[PDB]
Amino acid sequence: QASQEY
Amino acid sequence: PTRTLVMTSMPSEKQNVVIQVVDKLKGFSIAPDVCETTTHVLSGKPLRTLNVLLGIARGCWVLSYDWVLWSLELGHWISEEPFELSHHFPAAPLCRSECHLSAGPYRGTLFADQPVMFVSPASSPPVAKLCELVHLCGGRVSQVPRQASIVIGPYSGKKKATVKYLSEKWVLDSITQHKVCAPENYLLS
């Protein structure tokens, strides 16, 4: 899972 | 005790590469998340991740992967500024400059004039890390909503007329632009 973009 | 480097939005292969390069050039320790020892944050795609924000907040270099490709060929760590993501994150260069020009331990003062904030424990990003972000920018956070003049994130309590109920994007955008944004747009319902 890729780091979430905020 | 050594400085750390952290990768964000990074394809597996490029991660491998970076590991090699760092292994060869030394000088850095790879870390999974931005912390006090971090001074460089490498990104594969210029996306606003938690690591990016945190890296901006600590006055780190926020760079594109290319920096590691030229460093390998020249046989040493080269100038970071050419690979600094200033266009996508205007605060990066500014905060870094402050951090370097800082006399003694650096700490942001972006939210200095701001009143105490209450951050929703159901906020996104996670309330802990979002609070970290707030504190690294000279902000103040209470566990009690009653003391706050600004409430950030999901909140279903009684809405005081004097209080500001804002989204997490107010904080995030403020850290990105390095300018405290106008709350008017970030008003929650």
Which method resolved this structure?
A: X-ray
- B31-37, Cβ contacts within 8 angstroms, sequence gap of 24 or more: B31/B4, B31/B5, B31/B6, B32/B6, B33/B6, B34/B6, B34/B58, B34/B60, B35/B4, B37/B1, B37/B2, B37/B3, B37/B4
Q: CA B16 to CA B11: how far, in whole Å? A: 9
Are residues B79 and B140 located together in one domain of the fold? no
Do A6 and B8 make contact, defined as CB atoms within 8 angstroms?
no
| Domain, as residue range, for B173 | 99-187
**Distance (Å) of CA B94 to CA B46, B125, B182:** 17, 23, 20
**What whole-number distance in Å separates Cα of residue B52 and Cα of residue B46?**
9
Instruction: Name residues 166-185 of chain B within 8 A of A (Cβ).
Output: 168-169, 172
B165 shares a domain with B146:
yes
Same domain? For B93 and B177 the reply is no
Looking at the structure, tell me whether residues B161 and B93 fall in a common domain: no
Residue among A2, A3, A6 whose CB faces B172 most closely: A6
For residue A4, give the amino acid letter: Q
CB contact under 8 A, B53 and A6: yes
Same domain, B14 and B93: yes
Chain B residue nearest residue A5, CA to CA: B49
Count of CB atoms situated within 10 Å of the CB of B9: 19
**Domain C-terminal end among B98, B128, B157:** B98
Among B38, B73, B98, which residue terminates a domain? B98
- Rounded CA-CA distance B29/B69 in Å is 17
How many A/B residue pairs have CB atoms within 8 Å?
23
**Residue B185 backbone dihedrals phi, psi, to 5 degrees:** -80, -30
3-class secondary structure, A1: coil
Neighbours of B119 (CB within 10 A): 26
- Looking up residue B162, the CATH number of its domain turns out to be 3.40.50.10190
Work out how many domains chain B is built from and give that number. 2
For residue B4, the tally of other CB atoms under 10 A from its CB is: 20
Q: Is B56 on the interface with A (CB under 8 A)?
A: no
Reported resolution, Å: 2.6
